[PDB]
């Protein structure tokens, strides 16, 4: 039949995919250090012989919202949030390094510093931070310097042991990977530490998802979705009527 | 399941699966002290756990 049936179907299909991207945003409102995902549609025309009447649209992710997340003051010593722009460099389960903004850190039984996702926290030597096992008081600095008190030591024996690797690259050069870690679009790009990134210890950075912004985008995808499915029915209606040209 | 490449194009569009609660973290912040007249109740100021 007419190709407008599939031209509208290819549009309704993308609206559902855009709806899925907004659904993931609202599910992650309470998530810690979550960067909102933007949804956009690209107009692609079928170039060739004939009148230029058919143009497809596909939904794609143009970028992410890198605005500062909501800061939650918790009073916990091992809670860190990046003041302004900046990232925390961590290595995932496989070992590939990446940037994260979740500062819900913790100390394991061996002293290795991890975050809430389990990623190991990189240090001054581009290696995971391993603090002494018998600690007494962890006091993270504003610049990322970790000053710990050995167990049984006097309060005046406060010494720095490591400095968290904070990286502030261009946000437009970062893409979210398959596990929520932002990495460079260009492969084999070294993550260079920055001396301007600051860590506000004792607070946790929340999500930056604008709940109303997603809701008002939802009510427009539904209407656009319903208009296209009416086009599918009216293209079906036209073909059924034209079935009476072979009756003879 | 091929990934990466052009993530800002329709070819490399990535969709999430939602959210979850990974851990319920215990906040072991030292609490305030209650002064009671019972002589058999005790308290630890600073790190420490009673053993039973």
């Amino acid at each position: 039949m007419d190709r407008a049936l599939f031209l509208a179907m290819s549009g309704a299909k993308q609206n559902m995919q855009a709806l899925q991207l907004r659904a993931n945003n609202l599910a992650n409102v309470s998530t810690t250090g979550f960067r909102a995902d933007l949804a956009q549609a690209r107009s692609m025309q079928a170039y060739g012989e004939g009148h230029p009447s058919r143009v497809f649209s596909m939904t794609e992710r143009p970028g992410h919202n890198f605005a500062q997340g909501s800061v939650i003051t918790t009073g916990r010593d091992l809670d860190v949030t990046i003041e302004g722009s900046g990232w925390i460099s961590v290595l995932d389960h496989t070992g590939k390094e990446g940037l994260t903004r979740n500062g819900n850190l913790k100390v394991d039984q061996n002293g290795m510093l991890t975050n809430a996702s389990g990623h190991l926290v990189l240090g001054e030597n581009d290696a995971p931070i391993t603090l002494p096992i018998p600690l007494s008081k962890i006091e993270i600095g504003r610049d990322g310097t970790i000053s710990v008190l050995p167990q049984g030591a006097p309060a005046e024996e406060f010494q720095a042991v490591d400095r968290i690797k904070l990286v502030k690259p261009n946000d437009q050069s970062l893409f979210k990977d398959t596990n929520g870690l932002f990495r460079h679009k260009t492969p084999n790009q070294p993550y260079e530490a920055d001396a301007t990134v600051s860590l506000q210890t004792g607070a946790i950075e929340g999500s930056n998802v604008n709940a109303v912004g997603e809701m008002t985008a939802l009510i427009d995808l539904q209407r656009q979705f319903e208009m296209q499915v009416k086009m599918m029915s009216t293209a079906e209606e036209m073909d059924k009527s034209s079935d009476s040209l072979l009756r003879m | 399941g091929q990934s990466s490449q052009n993530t800002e194009l329709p070819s490399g569009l990535m969709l999430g699966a939602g959210s979850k609660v990974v851990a319920t973290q215990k906040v072991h912040t030292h609490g305030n002290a209650q002064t009671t007249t019972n002589a058999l109740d005790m308290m630890v100021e600073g790190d420490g756990f009673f053993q039973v």
């Binding site: 690209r42 692609m44 079928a46 | -």
Partner: peptide
């Protein structure tokens, strides 16, 4: 025409065709 018409191009980036 005496030759088949070409297909239709639907690229996500016209610069790469």
């Amino acid at each position: 025409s005496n030759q088949p018409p070409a297909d239709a191009s639907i690229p996500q980036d016209v610069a790469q065709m």
